Amino acid sequence: SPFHVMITSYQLVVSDVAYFQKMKWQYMILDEAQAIKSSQSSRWKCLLGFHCRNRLLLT
DNA sequence: TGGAGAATCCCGGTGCCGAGGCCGCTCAATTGGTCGTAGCAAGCTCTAGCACCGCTTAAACGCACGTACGCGCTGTCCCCCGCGTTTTAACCGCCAAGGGGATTACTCCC
Structure with a gap:
């Protein structure tokens, strides 16, 4: 696949x-x-x- | 009439980007029932639109005839066109900025 992980801004996910x-x-x-x-x-x-099968928060 | 040569066309080749079709979904068009009302209908009023007559004289017409002016002609000259040269700024690309509008945080006030 052309990617495995995708990095993005908290700004783009809402935009x-x-x-x-x-x-x-x-x-x-x-x-x-x-x-x-x-x-x-x-x-x-x-x-x-x-729609995500498992989720993790870092803080 | 010919000719030379420039300018316009045509034929086939190249490529790029936008036209035409596919996909997901929202939200705007449709189905169903309610209720108010306005404008469709019947009816009366009398306005004012159309028709006619008779008279008056100002407005329209046909004609004479003069001369003012539209038009084709001639001459010139100046100034705008066609073409070669010089130069400048329009176009393109790429980077900067800033601004503004929406969002998110954190406090104070209610």
Whole structure:
């Protein structure tokens, strides 16, 4: 495959959300998950909805 | 009439990018029922639109006839065109910036 892991910004996942939906992930890292701590944040609402089989938070 | 040569066309080849079709999904068009009302219908009023007559005289017409002006002609000259030279700035590409608008954090105030 042309990739195994994909690195991206907390900014792009909310901006390109319509492309991030329509995709399915085997594993996900959130690399400094204190970015997610506001449940009112769009980056909480969006990354929550990413179809991912197992998820990990780093903090 | 010919001719030379420039300018316009045509024929086939190359390639690139945008036109035409496929895919996922949202959300805007459709199905179903409600309820208010407006404008469709029947009816009365009398406005004002159309028709006719008779008179008046100003406005329209046919004609005479003069001369003012439209038009083809002639001459010139100046200034705008066709072509070669010189030069400048439009186009392209690539990097910078900044700005602004949406988002996210954290506190104070209610």
